Amino acid sequence: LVYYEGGAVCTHARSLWRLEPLRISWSGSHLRWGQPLRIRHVTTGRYLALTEDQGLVVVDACKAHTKATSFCFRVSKEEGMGPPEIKYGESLCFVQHVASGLWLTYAALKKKAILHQEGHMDDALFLTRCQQEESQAARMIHSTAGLYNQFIKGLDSFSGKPRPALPIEAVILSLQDLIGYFEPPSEELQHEEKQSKLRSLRNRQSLFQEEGMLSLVLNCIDRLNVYTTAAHFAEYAGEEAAESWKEIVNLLYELLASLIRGNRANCALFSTNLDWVVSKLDRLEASSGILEVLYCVLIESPEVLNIIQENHIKSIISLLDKHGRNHKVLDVLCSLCVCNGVAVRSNQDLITENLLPGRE
Amino acid sequence: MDILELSERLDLQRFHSHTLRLYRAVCALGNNRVAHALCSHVDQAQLLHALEDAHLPGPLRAGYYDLLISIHLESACRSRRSMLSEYIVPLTPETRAITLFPPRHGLPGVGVTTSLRPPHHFSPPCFVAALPAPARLSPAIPLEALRDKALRMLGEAVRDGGQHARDPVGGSVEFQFVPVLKLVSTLLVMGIFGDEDVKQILKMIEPEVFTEEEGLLQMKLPESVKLQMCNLLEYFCDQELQHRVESLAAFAERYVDKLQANQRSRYALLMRAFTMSAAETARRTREFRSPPQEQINMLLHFKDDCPLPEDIRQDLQDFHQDLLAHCGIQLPQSLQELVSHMVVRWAQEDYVQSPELVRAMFSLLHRQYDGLGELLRALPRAYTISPSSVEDTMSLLECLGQIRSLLIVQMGPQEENLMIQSIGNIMNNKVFYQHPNLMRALGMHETVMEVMVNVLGEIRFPKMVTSCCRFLCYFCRISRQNQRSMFDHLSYLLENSGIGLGMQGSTPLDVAAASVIDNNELALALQEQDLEKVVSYLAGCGLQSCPMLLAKGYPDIGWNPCGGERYLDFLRFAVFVNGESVEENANVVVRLLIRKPECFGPALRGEGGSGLLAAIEEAIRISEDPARDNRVHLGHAIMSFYAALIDLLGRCAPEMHLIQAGKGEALRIRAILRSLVPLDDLVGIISLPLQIPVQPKMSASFVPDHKASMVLFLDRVYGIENQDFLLHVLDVGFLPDMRAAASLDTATFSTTEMALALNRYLCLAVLPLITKCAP
Amino acid sequence: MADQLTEEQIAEFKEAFSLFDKDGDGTITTKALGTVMRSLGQNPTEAELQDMINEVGTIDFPAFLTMMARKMKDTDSEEEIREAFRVFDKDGNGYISAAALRHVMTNLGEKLTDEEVDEMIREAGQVNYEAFVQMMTA
Amino acid sequence: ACFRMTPLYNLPTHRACNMFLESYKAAWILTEDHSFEDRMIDDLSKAGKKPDPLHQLVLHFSRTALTEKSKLDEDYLYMAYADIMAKSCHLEEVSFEEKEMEKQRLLYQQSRLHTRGAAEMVLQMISACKGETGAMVSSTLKLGISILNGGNAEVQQKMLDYLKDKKEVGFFQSIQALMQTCSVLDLNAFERQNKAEGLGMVNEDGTVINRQNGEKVMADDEFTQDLFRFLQLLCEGHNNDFQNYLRTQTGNTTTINIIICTVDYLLRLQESISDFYWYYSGKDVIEEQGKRNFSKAMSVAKQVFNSLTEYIQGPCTGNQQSLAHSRLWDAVVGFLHVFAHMMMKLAQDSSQIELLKELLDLQ
Amino acid sequence: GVEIETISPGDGRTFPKKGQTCVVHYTGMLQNGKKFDSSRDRNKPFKFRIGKQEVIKGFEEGAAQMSLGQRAKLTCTPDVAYGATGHPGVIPPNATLIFDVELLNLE
């Protein structure tokens, strides 16, 4: 479905659209009126066309005919860089299908879009530009979503079937490079540059959260962490995958920690999925990543703390008792008590009544 | 292993430092029971020995000092810091002895001050007491050896810094100075230090300027200790300002005694006069009939008429010159000059890159260079109380501190119960009723609304919300100035009360309703946005039924009359004031109701066209069958909603004199109100009889107050002028009710509350109407 | 509005309630409320007390405070008539004239206008002090 | 109820002290003129490399404003210091030498601030408001007009350099939003205000602060005047660079027509003043209560017209062509109609000559 | 019950009487051998009146069986002392307590 929603959806990656002219040579010329060009969604990768099945429905690139997917621009109803220009923000434009010739207007704030012949007088659209960061992030969302969907499909192919090949190398490289991409800015930079980098990082994380990549990462890591030991994955998958499984899970935990570092919305999203993190905390392999994930979730979102009950605190105490004396668990425990100037009495009482009385 | 051995063992030292951090965090922001548990884990003596130790590592020493302060002094220090801003000075004999200058400036922070501050509550730790909810007190410390011991460490650290050793305690000068100075600053904020201790601390701060070795400001310091020095100087300046306020209050008492004696003398002289003039008597009448604020304004005007002798004017001028001299206006040897020069030099020597230090240093700089401005800003919080109410005011202040302590604590059962107990206590105190200006200056309303918003943001703890709303309503009812102060947050309250909770008792919408009542100014100042939000909520009230009603087993319908009844009541209160209708708000209410037809009931909609009389008949039929509808009955809900709508429409009608004048707006509104509801509907509703006593279910019965709204509409919008119309409506609806009341006047049915309700009806809704059109 | 009552009256009310506030919770029975009212000397009728209780068992200090303020509004109004009669003319013996109206308008304290004073006089040398006071009270 | 007002001597001393404190703080210490901003700004800028305390203060404010947040908190210290700096450079026939000396003194007092980085801080904190009114942004505008007072040239160059280097777009969005919110004379509100003013000046048993509460109509008159004065001083001196930059910013992603928004606000003010005249068309004379509001609106119109003039002044073809194609013509026609009828209505009487003088000045 | 293991001799004649104030210096010790409470660390005697319910049952019963100047080791069973619920973060459940207490004065 194609909507005309307005508001927070404007800043999200789904609102972005790309315009690819039919001709390949000198395709970067200025957009003249009547030029036959296509419109595609940058994130999903599908191609928008006026198919007879459902009118205005976006379709995959596997079937998009020129006569069915071409579009034209008209100012009114009525090689080289070539034509000078059409203004951004000040020049209106009317969308029109090349073959059908029907104007684009709202069919009926999730109002559907249909190509009625009458159209409307206020159906004109004016163009605005998007900076490099948004386009780069959206295309990365597309590529990572495709690769990760292929990986999770391959994982589900042999689920519970003891014995193609999973692209372990490409997946590992993607995780490492995404970790590098979401690296926090260093504190040595001045306040202006550091603040600009932090704002850019927050925008990038918000784009990833809106695109739904976080849910897919949760699905992938849940599927990969069903198994217990590398020998078990060797049994279901093979030796080659078993060798890289530790790296894959470590990098997945690292990416999950990085995607929710400092943003309130991403960590508040875990208000209902906290029990999953607490349950998978106790795993031996890849423990530092899940501990860092929990620490970031607890420090960033105050609303998460009210969900925690006695069993989660007891599990944290179990982690402290079973994984030596590390200060990260104790920092997590300290952050549990106080959140940005307000104290939670219940969790403080549980902490003071579980670990302290035992004296062991 | 020795605690001192951890110097080489980095991992164990780090783990112990973070363990101390956890100990602080669990016992942070109150939680005195956990503080007792930590006292069990960490003994009084153990902490004392560590504090005086010299070989302890830096992080461990800092963590130990912070642990001691957080489990022994934190809550009392927080309460005292909260009290530090409110100045309540009683007129005690010690207060009148306060002098602005010593009999040059004196040493700041030393002397006597009568400002009323609550005492500290402590409980000794005894861990074999029988297991027993009371608000458990914080742990107890000797607090007397601590004073001298802190002074001793401060002196020893100053001497060691003067010696310029290469092995400072804790491994750095910061770890040697910052924690002990933090402890000393907290002890000063608490006020434990006496006159001699304050004098010695002042001498340590500056040996030359404050004289009655080397100064601690004179020697080189890093930024971290500069932050605590800045805090200490801020506390000292605050103490100086408090002393100035106390002296100003003492002079106020003296001068008002003189002024009231002079005013009585002037009254006697004026009364003795016989044939002065036609203006001298006018002057006396103007001076003696104006409100006391006006009188004290006229008498205090002799600057740059004024029936005051030159002696009192000269005395006030002398006090004014003394106060300007004290402020440093002059129109290092003193505190202001010393702090200013220290701040300037600190900023000049190095480019400090710690934002907190910069902020605090410049805050002191502004406070010192603007003393008159600081005094002017602090004066509104100041107040004067009679010496006879000091105990009650102390109890009120303790209750206020207790309720303020819950501002930074998540809401729970014990906390909400203690909150309710505090509200009951503040209700039972008489000072809250005697002085509304004091009650507003302490500003309990702000923190009470903050707690209400914190809990509101399904709403848990409903009883505490209801008691909070009752307290807010009573505070509004106390005084008109408090009413203005609460109305200033009307939009905020309405945003909180956007969705009616529906719980029994008071609601934030009731707080909003009580915030604007019996005052023309507030109703005229009622802005567009609040009314627009209210009517939007009413419109949304007509699209779906109440989720609580659906979850209660009630049959599902397309709307919830109970939810809209509160909005109709609020609109009725906001339209009708002092037995009159305000035109500006009536215009807005009519237009906003008519813009959205969904605000009205589904029967009055143009599409359905059920009709109001038919709707009420269907409501009565529904109430007849229990299956079709304490537990709120749907028939009574729809009946009350329609009655409230009719009442709002009637009370929103233009005034009779406006109609007589012929102003277009009033005639247009009366016409549209007539068009909305026909007269036949009113006469039919009045025609409907009411069951009389074996008394019917009062909640589900046909309440006469519905007819009260109906007859109010009939009297206001339409009126009775024709003999035939009056006779017809009267015969149809009015006589049978009077006959029923006369029959029920018998002693067997006199005590029935149905008879009382119908009596209140007759005497307050219809009998005045018959009286008015008697001729 | 509870600001009408004087601090002496509010102290008397607090003492009267504390005389029967041995429980400490603040709750007072309806019979206890009537006993407190009798101790105050009002001696209100049973029907009036029941109506006041039903208007707003569960009687607390603020509720009795509001009830007493509503009751004492009548006493304040009773003294108001005498105050107006004694303030219309200082001597109060046939001293009604336009000069008194001019003096009142000059120093009313609310900054009244000459036209407003003329309108008030028209509401109603020769003048009636009682009629003028009644017109001012409307 | 005024007759039954109790005298002062009957009241207890514990409340008489309270009203004595209130009257004292209202009438004596508030009127005391303490000129101490100059001494502070001189002491802090002496520098005794390492920046002087004034530069550190400006840097700390810039750092506070640059921190990302939903909305900047009402910082009591920033507002206070901003006023201290602003009044410092405001002020401390006439011959040419004396006027030149006074001007040079004003430029030196402005250089005491604009070389420390005051302009960058002002732009940062007005851009960080995200288009929301308040007292802190009002103090920021006060500091801006004080720095730009007298049509200083180097300050405008520094502002242009910083604004182009940062390439931020939120500054013009904030200005547009702030100008959108600015109020215009409203007949309905005035009616509520004058109905409220008809009530007693003394409440029952207490004084009424209705007069001290302030007028509800044209409440943001000082704010609007300061904003338009800041804009006109920003384009003061026939600086062609800003005259071309305000209409359209080439570097920034989105262009905001500040001049067209100013014309839209002027048209809104014209509609409001025409409605206000139509309300007073029937009445023979003009009441003083409405006369004060009329004069306030007249001053606001004068300020906005001066701002538009200062935009136009200089051979800037782009701004002139943009304004020729806007809705300014309909506004001007409406002004001409209301001005003519206002002149004739005032000339009918003789007790409102000052309002006629203001009318002629705005003409 | 409680077992009074006499650490040191004390004056035999003096014994606690109901309604009298007892000052003690108890050095509490957990069952495992760890120390949780000590009055001597606080340097303040633990004043308590015998016959009331202010102090836990085992310590009161043992104090009834004490004598002036005498030292003893009073192991208290969990049912007697803080049974099945302990002071939060101080005493674990169903754990015995061992006290080292000697009397100072009986007045």
Please name the residue of chain B whose CA is at the shortest distance from the CA of residue C7. Answer: B434
From the CA of C28, how many Å to the nearest CA of chain D? 32
List the catalytic residue out of E37, E46, E48, E100: E37
Give the integer Cα–Cα distance in Å for C55 and B118. 39
Q: Is A3 helix (H, G, I), strand (E, B) or coil?
A: strand
Q: Which residues of A168-196 are buried (b: 16+ CB within 10 A; e: fewer)?
A: beebeebbeebeeebeeeeeeeeeeebbb
**Assigned token pair, B683:** 């006469």
C25, C27, C31, C33: CA torsion to nearest 10: 100
**Assigned token pair, D32:** 């005391």
DSSP designation for C116: H
Give the integer Cα–Cα distance in Å for B712 and D141. 54
**Assigned token pair, B711:** 């007859």
Q: Is E2 helix (H, G, I), strand (E, B) or coil?
A: strand
**Assigned token pair, B377:** 């800003």
Phi-psi region of B211 (alpha: psi -120 to 50; beta: other; left: phi over 0): beta
Check CB contact under 8 Å for D39 and B369. yes
Contact with chain B for residue C19, Cβ under 8 A: no
Phi-psi region of B577 (alpha: psi -120 to 50; beta: other; left: phi over 0): beta
Q: How far is CA C66 from CA A151, B49, B615, C4, C13, in A?
A: 74, 59, 39, 11, 11
In this structure, are strands A47-51 and E97-106 parallel, antiparallel, or unpaired? Answer: unpaired
Give the integer Cα–Cα distance in Å for B704 and E9. 88
Residue among B352, B362, B525 minimizing CB distance to D77: B362
In this structure, are strands B138-139 and B122-123 parallel, antiparallel, or unpaired? Answer: parallel
DSSP designation for D6: P
D191 is in an annotated binding site: no
Give the integer Cα–Cα distance in Å for B357 and B341. 16
Contact with chain B for residue C11, Cβ under 8 A: yes
Contact with chain A for residue D63, Cβ under 8 A: yes
Q: What share of chain A is helix, strand, coil (3-state, %, to 5)?
A: 50, 10, 35
**Assigned token pair, A178:** 């995404």
CA neighbours within 13 Å on the CB side: how many for D86?
18
Residue type at position A10: C
Residue type at position B221: L
- Domain annotation for chain E: domains and CATH numbers: 1-107 (3.10.50.40)
Q: How far is CA B733 from CA A12, B677, B710, in A?
A: 65, 18, 11
Q: How far is CA B219 from CA A123, A319, B156, B177, E68, in A?
A: 75, 49, 15, 12, 58
**Assigned token pair, D180:** 């959108």
Residues A72 and A94 sit within 8 Å (Cβ to Cβ): no
**Assigned token pair, B433:** 């009723």
Experimental technique used? cryo-EM
Phi-psi region of C73 (alpha: psi -120 to 50; beta: other; left: phi over 0): alpha
Q: What share of chain C is helix, strand, coil (3-state, %, to 5)?
A: 65, 0, 30
Give the integer Cα–Cα distance in Å for A294 and A329. 10
Burial (0-12, 13-18, 19+ Cβ within 10 Å), C117 = middle
Contact with chain B for residue C20, Cβ under 8 A: no
Q: Which residues of A137-165 are buried (b: 16+ CB within 10 A; e: fewer)?
A: bbbbbbebbeebeebbebbeeeeeeeeee
From the CA of B755, how many Å to the nearest CA of chain C? 13
This PDB structure is determined at a resolution in Å of 3.8
Alpha helices in E6-103 (DSSP H): 39-42, 57-64
Phi-psi region of A286 (alpha: psi -120 to 50; beta: other; left: phi over 0): left
Give the integer Cα–Cα distance in Å for C112 and C119. 11
Residues B686 and B711 sit within 8 Å (Cβ to Cβ): yes
Give the integer Cα–Cα distance in Å for B157 and B182. 14
Among chain A, residues having any CB pair with chain D shorter than 8 Å are 89-90, 128-129, 131, 191-192, 195, 198-199, 202
Test the D interface: residue of A192, A193, A205 with most D CBs within 10 Å = A192
Task: Please confirm, yes or no, whether E36 is among the known catalytic residues.
Answer: yes
CA-based radius of gyration for chain A? 26
In this structure, are strands E46-49 and E21-30 parallel, antiparallel, or unpaired? Answer: antiparallel
Residues D92 and D86 sit within 8 Å (Cβ to Cβ): no
D255 contacts on A by Cβ (under 8 Å)? 89-90
What A7-11 contacts at long range (C-beta under 8 Å, 24+ apart), as own/partner pairs, is A7/A109, A11/A206
Helix or strand holding residue E103 (H, E): strand E97-106
- For D115, residues 6+ apart whose C-beta sits below 8 A from its C-beta are none
Residue among D201, D205, D206 minimizing CB distance to C111: D201
Burial (0-12, 13-18, 19+ Cβ within 10 Å), C8 = exposed
C80 contacts on D by Cβ (under 8 Å)? 4
**Assigned token pair, B395:** 């109890």
**Assigned token pair, B209:** 């300027």
E91 contacts on A by Cβ (under 8 Å)? 357
D37 is in an annotated binding site: no
A156, A162, A167, A172: CA torsion to nearest 10: 90
Name A105's bridge partners.
A114
Helix or strand holding residue B87 (H, E): strand B87-90
Taking alpha carbons only, the member of B232, B208, B235 closest to residue B221 is: B232
Contact flag for A and B (3+ C-beta pairs < 8 Å) = yes
Give the integer Cα–Cα distance in Å for C68 and C58. 16
Signed CA dihedral, B678, B681, B684, B685: sign only: negative
Contact with chain A for residue D93, Cβ under 8 A: no
**Assigned token pair, B732:** 């149809």
Give the integer Cα–Cα distance in Å for B92 and B114. 8
- For A223, residues 6+ apart whose C-beta sits below 8 A from its C-beta are A152, A155, A156, A159
Other Cβ atoms within 10 Å of E93 Cβ, number: 11
**Assigned token pair, B643:** 């009655």
Residues A71 and A95 sit within 8 Å (Cβ to Cβ): yes
Residues A274 and A240 sit within 8 Å (Cβ to Cβ): no
E90 contacts on A by Cβ (under 8 Å)? 357
Residue among A89, A129, A199 minimizing CB distance to D68: A199
Check CB contact under 8 Å for B260 and D16. yes
Q: How many residues does chain E have?
A: 107
Place of tokens 């005694």: B257
Give the integer Cα–Cα distance in Å for E59 and E80. 9
**Assigned token pair, B633:** 């009955």
Contact with chain B for residue C63, Cβ under 8 A: no
Taking alpha carbons only, the member of B264, B243, B235, B261 closest to residue B81 is: B235
Give the integer Cα–Cα distance in Å for B726 and A248. 90
List the catalytic residue out of E46, E56, E98, E100: E56
Please name the residue of chain C whose CA is at the shortest distance from the CA of residue D203. Answer: C110
Residues B118 and B394 sit within 8 Å (Cβ to Cβ): yes
Q: How far is CA B517 from CA B510, B512, B570, C1, D271, in A?
A: 11, 9, 10, 10, 36
Phi-psi region of E82 (alpha: psi -120 to 50; beta: other; left: phi over 0): left
Residue type at position A21: P
Place of tokens 């709202």: A106
Q: Which residues of D154-192 are buried (b: 16+ CB within 10 A; e: fewer)?
A: ebbebbbeebeebebbebbbbbebbbeebbbbbeebbeb
Residues C101 and C117 sit within 8 Å (Cβ to Cβ): yes
Place of tokens 């991403």: A266
Q: Is B344 helix (H, G, I), strand (E, B) or coil?
A: helix
Q: How far is CA B711 from CA B111, B636, B701, in A?
A: 71, 19, 19
Check CB contact under 8 Å for A346 and B412. yes
Ordered DSSP codes for A207-246 = HHHHHTHHHHHHHHHHHHTSS-SHHHHHHHT-HHHHHHHH
- For A256, residues 6+ apart whose C-beta sits below 8 A from its C-beta are A214, A217, A218, A221, A289, A293
Contact with chain B for residue E53, Cβ under 8 A: yes
Q: What are phi and psi of B57, to 5 degrees?
A: -65, 160
Give the integer Cα–Cα distance in Å for C132 and C88. 8
E82 contacts on B by Cβ (under 8 Å)? 131
CA neighbours within 13 Å on the CB side: how many for B530?
25
DSSP designation for B137: P
Residues B633 and B699 sit within 8 Å (Cβ to Cβ): yes
Task: Please confirm, yes or no, whether E56 is among the known catalytic residues.
Answer: yes
List the catalytic residue out of E7, E11, E15, E36: E36
Give the integer Cα–Cα distance in Å for B144 and B147. 5
Contact with chain C for residue D200, Cβ under 8 A: yes
Give the integer Cα–Cα distance in Å for A59 and B473. 61
Residue type at position B181: L
Q: What are phi and psi of A325, to 5 degrees?
A: -105, 85
- For E65, residues 6+ apart whose C-beta sits below 8 A from its C-beta are E2, E4
Q: Say how far residue D110 (Cα) sits from the centre of its chain.
A: 20
E59 contacts on B by Cβ (under 8 Å)? 128
Check CB contact under 8 Å for A356 and B37. yes
Task: Please confirm, yes or no, whether E46 is among the known catalytic residues.
Answer: no
Give the integer Cα–Cα distance in Å for B465 and B455. 8
Contact with chain D for residue C19, Cβ under 8 A: no
Give the integer Cα–Cα distance in Å for E32 and A359. 10
Helix or strand holding residue D65 (H, E): helix D53-66
B126 contacts on E by Cβ (under 8 Å)? 46
Alpha helices in A73-167 (DSSP H): 132-157
Task: Please confirm, yes or no, whether E100 is among the known catalytic residues.
Answer: no
Other Cβ atoms within 10 Å of D76 Cβ, number: 13
Q: Say how far residue B47 (Cα) sits from the centre of its chain.
A: 40
**Assigned token pair, E75:** 């192991």
Residues B201 and B249 sit within 8 Å (Cβ to Cβ): no
Give the integer Cα–Cα distance in Å for B220 and B174. 12
Give the integer Cα–Cα distance in Å for B627 and B631. 14
Taking alpha carbons only, the member of B624, B732, B648 closest to residue B682 is: B732
Give the integer Cα–Cα distance in Å for B422 and B445. 14
Give the integer Cα–Cα distance in Å for E92 and E76. 14
Residue type at position B598: E
Residue type at position B57: P
**Assigned token pair, A331:** 């920092």
Phi-psi region of D221 (alpha: psi -120 to 50; beta: other; left: phi over 0): alpha
In chain B, DSSP finds a helix count (H) and a strand count (E) of 41, 6
Q: Which residues of A322-358 are buried (b: 16+ CB within 10 A; e: fewer)?
A: ebeebbbbbbbbbbbbbbeeebbbbbbbbbbbbbbbe
Helix or strand holding residue A51 (H, E): strand A47-51
Give the integer Cα–Cα distance in Å for B528 and C61. 37
DSSP designation for A102: P
DSSP designation for B715: I
DSSP designation for C59: B
